[PDB]
Design a protein around this ligand. Structure first.
Ligand SMILES: COC(=O)c1ccc(O)c(OC)c1
Ligand SMILES: COC(=O)c1ccc(O)c(OC)c1
Lengths: 208, 208
């Protein structure tokens, strides 16, 4: 049982701007997703300070990067707070409609695509490299869900019955055919060291 | 009725490090506080998406900067989410104990004080310039409280009976005697334009 939703107009415009603008510095998508993971891990850590049972669903707070050259996917897994169904539908827990407005203004006023995360909409930079993005997520207060979108104006939500994850978010990037450099160990290491060296959680790059 | 609490050891060490290290670039405190305000304004905006009555306590989302040369105070007011008493006691809603550990590591590994906000403890940069900091805060789910600290290991919390604020946080910076440049309109404008030009809420600098 799949539900199909329309992106808000402003988010659909932001997505096609990302997909359609000539912009070579695509590697910033990973920085953006790891930061979001870091924020989600901060929120569950904070909750746990006053309610340690919040961590019943898994105590280890970390980030895994899993390339798979067969499936052509790069997956970012965190054991952060997770998202509820309502969070997923509301632009994955973000204020994306006003974040998009602020980002658009900035882009006229001289800004570039790499500053996207300053406007709270760094998630959508996933579309610099992915033809399709699948987000599996489990929050303590809800069931496990899968969100999916290949852009074009709509996303689906379904309850996910695949591999239980306990708590956190997996962002599965189905990479565009010319973006397979982001599955190479060397290149992912370079990028993590470049843009994500002061993240306060361990980041494990899986090998194949 | 005032309660006096001990800072966690790690926070007390972070504070005296801020107070005691030779570091000229003190102006970053304002960037750090405005960002925290921006995050708080993002959280109430998000909550309001699905429950517009959240905004009953005030619909305008913004930031005010109020210098007062008489009192020698610079106050940053936001109409963000606010903090509960429990948030105030738990390091003002932050994961400051692990943020301090990550920041300390980074400072050995070559980092400088200006990167503090990357470790989620930018609030404490207030002590680059303030001999004392008072935080008045009102969350929808709680009463209005005042938190206060001149560092030295302890902070107080009291319910605040002064001017009702509706919803949000006021950070009152009692500036060190040699830090009065941060009360000059020109200097605050310069800093806001330098470090806080893509904040997605209006920032009003009051005049005297
Ligand atoms: C709370 O939201 C999250 O847990 C979360 C985590 C990772 C992400 O890449 C993400 O995109 C918005 C959201
Ligand atoms: C939710 O926390 C807040 O609303 C908040 C707002 C402004 C600040 O400067 C701050 O320091 C921690 C916290």
């Amino acid at each position: 049982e799949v539900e199909t939703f329309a992106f808000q107009a402003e988010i659909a415009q932001l997505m096609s701007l990302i997909i359609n603008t000539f912009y070579s510095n695509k590697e910033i998508f990973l920085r953006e997703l790891i930061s979001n993971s870091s924020d989600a891990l901060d929120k569950i850590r904070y909750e746990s300070l006053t309610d340690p049972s919040k961590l019943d669903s898994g105590k280890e707070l970390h980030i895994n990067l899993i390339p798979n050259k067969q499936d052509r996917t790069l997956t970012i897994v965190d054991t952060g707070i997770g998202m509820t169904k309502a969070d997923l539908i509301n632009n994955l827990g973000t204020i994306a409609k006003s974040g998009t407005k602020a980002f658009m203004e900035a882009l006229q006023a001289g800004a570039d695509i790499s500053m996207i995360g300053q406007f709270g909409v760094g998630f959508y930079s996933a579309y610099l490299v992915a033809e399709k993005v699948t987000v599996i997520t489990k929050h303590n207060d809800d069931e496990q869900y899968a969100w999916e979108s290949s852009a074009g104006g709509s996303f689906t939500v379904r309850t996910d019955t695949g591999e239980p994850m306990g708590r956190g978010t997996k962002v599965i990037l189905h990479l565009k055919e010319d973006q397979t450099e982001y599955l190479e160990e060397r290149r992912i290491k370079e990028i993590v060291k470049k843009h994500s060296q002061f993240i306060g959680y361990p980041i494990t790059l899986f090998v194949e």
